[PDB]
């Protein structure tokens, strides 16, 4: 029993811009960003832990029923669909475009 | 009253299980370990256990003594000093410690003081045998 | 380093059978459960189920009941495995990408992807 | 106050979780046997004949199972003792030559010699010839044998076989004079630490116990090893209890445990003759030379209604868990032969019973009561001789044939679950359950759930108006 | 006036080095030997030594704790006794010894009869012990 | 190959300096033997006698 | 023919440098144990040592 929905399905940010996703979870949340056709990497784990190896631009926190992913100095590369997973149940997410 | 056994009294208060000391004392260097245990016999599997559980059975016996050695209480189960008690670790009053607090409760309060009071409680004793030295 | 090599897509025939396989080199193998994911071409991922590697006991959902089969064949000395999956009879809805992945923790954490292999019919 | 000083006493009820060597101590009654057992070996201290059980009375502690160290130190016991015990026997080398195997051909008419109809071992074994080496090096022997299909891989060339083993690692031959017979274990602190027990009826792995006592050993624990269900544990005392580290996550095995013991009565009706040939220098091997009289396949015997009320009161307790959802019991999907099938051993033979009977059923909504009268269930099970128990980890065993028959008795205290997960069709009011799961650890968690290791502290620092007498 | 080191006062003369005795006396029985240690991982190459020094450490100490047993001074930094010094030792007078030597170099000077001397410590306190029981 | 040495150094190449050795080995099977070949540097092989033996 | 023991065991040659001669063994206790001696020329096996050393 895993209750989880991303209220934002896509978004048109500019470029330079901080911009906020909300995922709503039950349990433990973790983020993996997905460009076009490729394999998820692992941004986040547990919704705010840092994963090594991802710049420090990228970061999530907690309150509640509610998760945030920040992506502050947006980048042309930082172009990807952004995924909020729980054990065995995935969003479709969110896709990025300027 | 009635007499407790080992850790009988860790759930009262202070005042009442300071008289049940003798019964946690009187356990801390003799156990079945040292039995006679019934391919070296003692190079089995639990025959190297029972090894290491002997030399750990010691260590924890002296680890209590050399302390009580330093601030020269040896051979006293209560002891008193000539430390004045500081407002820092703790300002509580007799009633609210020793009809309120459990020895658990207590020694938890004031961990981070432990270490200060210990090097305390052995330079003062050090100070009555250089005062008693150069005195007679 | 940890890597989780795949193999090449696949191209099959309804009623037919595949065979994806992930190759796991870099690390304890035994010691970490490996997932299957499912991602359709514009949809998101599902979950295919995971495999004990020691014991190789698999766990699926409902869905993938009697079809999907998960087995793994490990190195003389542990070094490398190789984990399979196979699918027994295919629709037009079996054309996605399969991926295995490496759960970290209790958190589920996927640090490790597959490349991914598109099977289509 | 000004009258305050500092004072100390010695003797203090306190202490912190820690972890330590903890060493085994075995009732001397099961002892001077010289059976030789593998794992309560004569270095175990003899136990108390008095042990102090110690009420703590206004005191909670923090107990968390799935963390606990006792665990994990006896799993290293328990393999290390399995090694050793190994060491001296006979390495089956000369065994990994060519196999050329065909059909068992027998002599006798024993028709069933009772009820059960399973089969008949006749398909379930080979009888396989091959060159081995005479006590002389350059002389070589034909010899025969009867070998389970299970213990037998073929390679090419039909009709010409392998032991499995021969491309892994190599097998010892376990010594006749060695027993399996699991005998408890009490798991003792050295003095300045202590055990603490939960003494709560309904206390499931983690959080705060409020009926905690103080213990110095734990009680005879049995390092009985088996899969899918334990076997001759401890039963509950409260009710049945659903522990497991996390409910909400499908990885983690769900442990019952039963407050009513459920018979399990396995038998092995063959009767199967044990030769001896010679394949080297001081080196004897132990076959199955001739299966004569009573041919069936082995099997175990369930009262078909004690396990409905068994299977009947843990979905009870599950639908707590899982509440506007139905339960149901399915048969493993797959793996290694130890995880489908109920793996045990009994004198020596090591059986794996199919157990498919006891978890095929669903419990949709219990709308009305359903009775049947009583049936006995009976489960094929198979023998197996190459035996690799610890995952690939501990030394490969050989067990050399049992003379007779063989029966076991034992019970069942407790089931190891593997729910599965699912997104849509698994949350259509249904939760499948399947046997099996976890590990051989949590064959000891079961049992060491309720302890909890801690070391004394007994010096106390405290203010008094007592000041030190100056001379 | 500064606190010293482990060791830190060996250079110094008596007068000076004896008012840093609970550096040293702090440090015999308590050290990092005694960790958790991070193919039985007990009998490896390094399982055994750390073993070993464990027990080597208790019997430095324990070899030091006999005497002062024997003596009477349990619990005393500096333990004063009722044996006269007898000129045959050493005949050097206070300014000597406090003020002119350190203590490894005086160690060394009645390194004769420091068996000699421990003999009358012990036969010293016997006595006191005998005088007790008989006069009480 | 063709590699035409990959860098500035002269030094030579591994070939004199290696040898090209088979030999007959047990499979699996204690009864069987196989034929398998190896690269072995000259430091690591002496020979006995049967010159290319 | 062949060596008696290769029906029974497996054996090993004694190593060249070992030396088989007996040199004398003192069994000594540890600290806080003691050992009684008994010092009566006509003694036998049990009984009671009136001259214990
Ligand atoms: C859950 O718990 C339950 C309950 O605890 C477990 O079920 C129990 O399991 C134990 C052990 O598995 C069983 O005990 C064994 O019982 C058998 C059968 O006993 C009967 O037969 C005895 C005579 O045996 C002869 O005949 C049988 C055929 O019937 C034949 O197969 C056998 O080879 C032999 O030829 C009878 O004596 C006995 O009657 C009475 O006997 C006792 C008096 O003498 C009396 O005290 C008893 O109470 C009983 O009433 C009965 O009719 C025993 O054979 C077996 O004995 C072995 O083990 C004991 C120690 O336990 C040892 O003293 C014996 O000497 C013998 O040990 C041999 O085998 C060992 C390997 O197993 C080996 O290590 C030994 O060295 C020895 O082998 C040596 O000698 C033999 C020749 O003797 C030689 O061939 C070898 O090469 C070697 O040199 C046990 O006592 C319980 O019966 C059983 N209870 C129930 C209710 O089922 C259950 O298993 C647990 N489950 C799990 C998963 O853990
Ligand atoms: C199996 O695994 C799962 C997955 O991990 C695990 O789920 C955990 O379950 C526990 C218990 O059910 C959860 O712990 C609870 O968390 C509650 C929510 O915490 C968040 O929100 C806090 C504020 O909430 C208030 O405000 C909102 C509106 O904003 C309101 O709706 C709420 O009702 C509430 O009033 C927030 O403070 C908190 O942040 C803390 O925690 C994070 C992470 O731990 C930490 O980083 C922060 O620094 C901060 O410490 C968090 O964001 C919470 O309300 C609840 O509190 C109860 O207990 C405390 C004492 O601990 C009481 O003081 C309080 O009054 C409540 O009685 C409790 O803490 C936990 O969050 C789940 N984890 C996840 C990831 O979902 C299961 O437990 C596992 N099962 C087993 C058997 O192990
Ligand atoms: C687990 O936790 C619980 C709770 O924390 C803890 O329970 C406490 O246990 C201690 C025992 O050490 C109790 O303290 C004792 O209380 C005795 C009873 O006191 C009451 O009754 C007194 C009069 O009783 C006499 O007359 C009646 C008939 O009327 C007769 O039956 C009796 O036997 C007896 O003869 C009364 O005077 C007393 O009043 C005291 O307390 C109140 C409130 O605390 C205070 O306001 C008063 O000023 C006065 O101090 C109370 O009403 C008592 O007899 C006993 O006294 C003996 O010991 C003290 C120790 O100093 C001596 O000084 C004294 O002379 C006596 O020898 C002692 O005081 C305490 O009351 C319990 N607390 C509660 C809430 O019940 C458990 O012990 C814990 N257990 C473990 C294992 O940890
Ligand atoms: C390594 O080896 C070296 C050499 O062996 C050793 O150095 C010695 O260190 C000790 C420290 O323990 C020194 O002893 C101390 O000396 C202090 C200085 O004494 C001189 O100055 C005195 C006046 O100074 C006052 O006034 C000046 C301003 O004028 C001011 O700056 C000062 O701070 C201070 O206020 C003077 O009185 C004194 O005279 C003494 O000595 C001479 C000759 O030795 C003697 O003839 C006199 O009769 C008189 O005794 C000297 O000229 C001194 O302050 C200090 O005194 C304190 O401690 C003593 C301890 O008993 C108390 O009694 C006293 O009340 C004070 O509290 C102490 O005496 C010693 O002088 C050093 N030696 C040399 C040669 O330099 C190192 O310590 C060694 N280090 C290690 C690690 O081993
Ligand atoms: C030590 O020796 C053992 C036994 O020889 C090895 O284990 C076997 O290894 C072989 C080689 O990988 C495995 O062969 C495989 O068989 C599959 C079909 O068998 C399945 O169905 C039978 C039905 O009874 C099961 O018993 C069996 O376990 C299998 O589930 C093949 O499908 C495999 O792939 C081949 O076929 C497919 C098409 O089906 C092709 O696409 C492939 O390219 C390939 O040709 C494969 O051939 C065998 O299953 C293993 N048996 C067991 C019990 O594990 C160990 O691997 C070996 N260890 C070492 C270290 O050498
Ligand atoms: C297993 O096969 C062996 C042959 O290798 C059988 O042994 C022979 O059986 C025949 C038939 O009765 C006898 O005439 C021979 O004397 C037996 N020995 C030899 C060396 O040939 C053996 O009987 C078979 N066992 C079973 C159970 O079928
Ligand atoms: C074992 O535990 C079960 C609960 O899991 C007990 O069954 C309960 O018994 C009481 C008393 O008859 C009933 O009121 C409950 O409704 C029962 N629960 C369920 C889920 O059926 C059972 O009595 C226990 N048995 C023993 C011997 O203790
Ligand atoms: C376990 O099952 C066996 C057989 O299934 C039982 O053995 C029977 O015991 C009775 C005695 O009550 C005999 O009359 C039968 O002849 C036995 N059967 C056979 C095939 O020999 C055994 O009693 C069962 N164990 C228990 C504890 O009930
Ligand atoms: C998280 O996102 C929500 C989106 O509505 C926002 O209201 C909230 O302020 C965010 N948390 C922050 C900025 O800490
Ligand atoms: C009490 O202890 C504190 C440090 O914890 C210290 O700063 C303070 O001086 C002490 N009080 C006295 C009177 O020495
Ligand atoms: C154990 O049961 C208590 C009581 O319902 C509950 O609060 C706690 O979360 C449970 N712990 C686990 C691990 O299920
Ligand atoms: C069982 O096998 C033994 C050993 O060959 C034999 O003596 C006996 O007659 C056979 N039958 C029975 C019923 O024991
Ligand atoms: C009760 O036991 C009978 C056999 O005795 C079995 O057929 C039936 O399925 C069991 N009850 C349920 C609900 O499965
Ligand atoms: C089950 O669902 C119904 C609605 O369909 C709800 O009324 C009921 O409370 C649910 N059960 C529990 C235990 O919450
Ligand atoms: C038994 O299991 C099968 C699948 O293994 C299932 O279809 C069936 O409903 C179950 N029950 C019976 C009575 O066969
Ligand atoms: C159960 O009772 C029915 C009567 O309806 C009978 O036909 C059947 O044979 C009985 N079965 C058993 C196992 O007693
Ligand atoms: C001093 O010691 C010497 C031997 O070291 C001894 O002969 C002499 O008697 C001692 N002095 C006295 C007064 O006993
Ligand atoms: C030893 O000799 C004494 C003296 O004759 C005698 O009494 C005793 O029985 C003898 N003991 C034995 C064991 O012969």
């Known amino acids: 029993d895993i209750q989880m929905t991303q209220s934002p399905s896509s978004l048109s940010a500019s470029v330079g811009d901080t911009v906020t996703i909300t995922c709503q979870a039950n349990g433990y949340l973790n983020w993996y960003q997905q460009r076009r056709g490729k394999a998820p990497k692992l941004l986040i784990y547990d919704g705010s832990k840092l994963e090594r190896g991802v710049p420090s631009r990228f970061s999530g926190r907690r309150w509640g029923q509610e998760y945030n992913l920040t992506i502050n100095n947006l980048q042309p590369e930082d172009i990807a669909t952004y995924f909020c997973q729980v054990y065995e149940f995935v969003v479709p997410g969110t896709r990025l475009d300027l | 009253a009635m007499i407790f056994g080992f850790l009988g009294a860790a759930g009262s208060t202070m005042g009442a299980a300071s008289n049940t000391l003798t019964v946690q004392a009187r356990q801390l260097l003799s156990g079945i370990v040292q039995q006679q245990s019934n391919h070296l016999l003692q190079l089995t599997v639990w025959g190297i256990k029972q090894l290491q559980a002997?030399?750990?059975?010691?260590?924890?016996?002296?680890?209590?003594?050399?302390?009580?050695?330093?601030?020269?209480?040896?051979?006293?189960?209560?002891?008193?000093?000539?430390?004045?008690?500081?407002?820092?670790?703790?300002?509580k009053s007799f009633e609210q410690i020793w009809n309120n607090m459990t020895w658990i409760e207590w020694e938890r309060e004031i961990s981070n003081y432990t270490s200060q009071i210990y090097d305390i409680l052995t330079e003062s004793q050090f100070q009555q045998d250089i005062n008693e030295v150069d005195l007679l | 380093?940890?890597?989780?090599?795949?193999?090449?897509?696949?191209?099959?025939?309804?009623?037919?059978?595949?065979?994806?396989?992930?190759?796991?080199?870099?690390?304890?193998?035994?010691?970490?459960?490996?997932?299957?994911?499912?991602?359709?071409?514009?949809?998101?991922?599902?979950?295919?189920?995971?495999?004990?590697?020691?014991?190789?006991?698999?766990?699926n959902p409902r869905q993938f009941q009697g079809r999907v089969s998960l087995t793994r064949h490990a190195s003389w000395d542990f070094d490398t495995y190789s984990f399979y999956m196979d699918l027994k009879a295919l629709r037009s809805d079996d054309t996605a990408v399969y991926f295995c992945a490496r759960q970290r923790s209790d958190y589920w954490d996927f640090d490790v992807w597959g490349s991914g292999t598109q099977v289509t019919v | 106050a000004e009258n305050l000083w500092v004072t100390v006493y010695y003797g203090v009820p306190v202490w912190k979780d820690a972890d330590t060597t903890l060493?085994?101590?075995?009732?001397?009654?099961?002892?001077?046997?010289?059976?030789?057992?593998?794992?309560?070996?004569?270095?175990?201290?003899?136990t108390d004949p008095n042990p102090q059980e110690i009420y703590m009375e206004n005191?909670?502690?923090?107990?968390?199972?799935?963390?606990?160290?006792?665990?994990?130190?006896?799993?290293?016991?328990?393999?290390?003792?399995?090694?050793?015990?190994?060491?001296?026997?006979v390495k089956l080398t000369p065994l990994c030559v060519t196999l050329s195997c065909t059909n068992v051909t027998l002599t006798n008419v024993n028709y069933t010699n009772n009820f059960p109809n399973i089969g008949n071992i006749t398909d379930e074994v080979r009888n396989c010839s091959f060159n081995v080496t005479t006590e002389i090096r350059?002389?070589?022997?034909?010899?025969?044998?009867?070998?389970?299909?299970?213990?037998?891989?073929?390679?090419?060339?039909?009709?010409?076989?392998?032991?499995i083993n021969c491309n892994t690692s190599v097998c010892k031959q376990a010594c006749p004079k060695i027993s399996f017979d699991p005998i408890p274990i009490h798991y003792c602190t050295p003095a300045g630490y202590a055990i603490l027990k939960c003494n709560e009826k309904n206390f499931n792995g983690t959080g705060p116990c409020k009926n905690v006592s103080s213990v110095q050993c734990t009680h005879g624990i049995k390092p009985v090893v088996s899969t899918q269900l334990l076997l001759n544990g401890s039963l509950a005392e409260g009710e049945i209890i659903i522990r497991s580290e996390n409910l909400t996550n499908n990885a983690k095995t769900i442990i019952v445990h039963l407050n009513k013991s459920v018979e399990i009565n396995c038998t092995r009706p063959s009767n199967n003759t044990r030769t001896s040939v010679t394949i080297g220098p001081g080196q004897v091997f132990y076959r199955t030379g001739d299966i004569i009289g009573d041919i069936r396949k082995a099997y175990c015997e369930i009262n078909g209604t004690k396990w409905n009320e068994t299977l009947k009161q843990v979905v009870g307790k599950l639908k707590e868990h899982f509440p506007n959802?139905?339960?149901?019991?399915?048969?493993?999907?797959?793996?290694?032969?130890?995880?489908?099938?109920?793996?045990?051993?009994?004198?020596?033979?090591?059986?794996?019973?199919?157990?498919?009977?006891?978890?095929?059923?669903?419990?949709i909504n219990s709308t009305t009561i359903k009775e049947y009268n009583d049936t006995i269930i009976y489960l094929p099970c198979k023998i197996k001789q190459i035996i690799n128990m610890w995952q690939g980890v501990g030394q490969c065993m050989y067990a050399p044939p049992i003379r007779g028959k063989i029966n076991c008795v034992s019970n069942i205290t407790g089931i190891l679950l593997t729910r599965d997960g699912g997104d849509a069709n698994a949350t259509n009011?249904?939760?499948?359950?399947?046997?099996?799961?976890?590990?051989?650890?949590?064959?000891?968690?079961?049992?060491?759930?309720?302890?909890?290791?801690?070391?004394?502290?007994?010096?106390?620092?405290?203010?008094?108006?007592?000041?030190?007498?100056?001379v």
């Open chain 2, 54 to 91: 002997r030399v750990l059975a010691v260590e924890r016996y002296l680890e209590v003594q050399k302390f009580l050695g330093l601030w020269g209480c040896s051979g006293k189960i209560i002891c008193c000093t000539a430390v004045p008690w500081n407002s820092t670790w703790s300002n």
């Open chain 3, 1 to 59: 380093q940890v890597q989780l090599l795949q193999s090449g897509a696949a191209v099959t025939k309804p009623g037919a059978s595949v065979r994806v396989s992930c190759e796991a080199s870099g690390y304890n193998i035994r010691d970490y459960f490996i997932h299957w994911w499912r991602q359709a071409p514009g949809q998101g991922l599902q979950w295919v189920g995971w495999i004990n590697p020691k014991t190789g006991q698999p766990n």
């Open chain 4, 325 to 363: 959802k139905t339960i149901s019991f399915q048969p493993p999907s797959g793996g290694d032969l130890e995880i489908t099938m109920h793996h045990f051993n009994c004198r020596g033979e090591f059986f794996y019973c199919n157990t498919t009977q006891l978890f095929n059923s669903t419990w």
């Open chain 4, 59 to 89: 005191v909670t502690e923090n107990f968390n199972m799935w963390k606990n160290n006792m665990v994990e130190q006896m799993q290293e016991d328990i393999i290390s003792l399995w090694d050793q015990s190994l060491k001296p026997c």
């Open chain 4, 138 to 163: 350059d002389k070589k022997q034909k010899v025969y044998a009867l070998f389970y299909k299970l213990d037998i891989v073929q390679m090419e060339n039909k009709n010409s076989y392998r032991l």
């Open chain 4, 429 to 470: 009011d249904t939760e499948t359950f399947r046997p099996g799961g976890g590990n051989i650890k949590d064959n000891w968690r079961s049992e060491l759930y309720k302890y909890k290791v801690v070391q004394i502290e007994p010096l106390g620092i405290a203010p008094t108006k007592c000041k030190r007498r100056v």
């Open chain 4, 23 to 46: 060493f085994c101590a075995s009732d001397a009654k099961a002892h001077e046997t010289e059976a030789h057992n593998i794992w309560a070996t004569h270095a175990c201290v003899p």
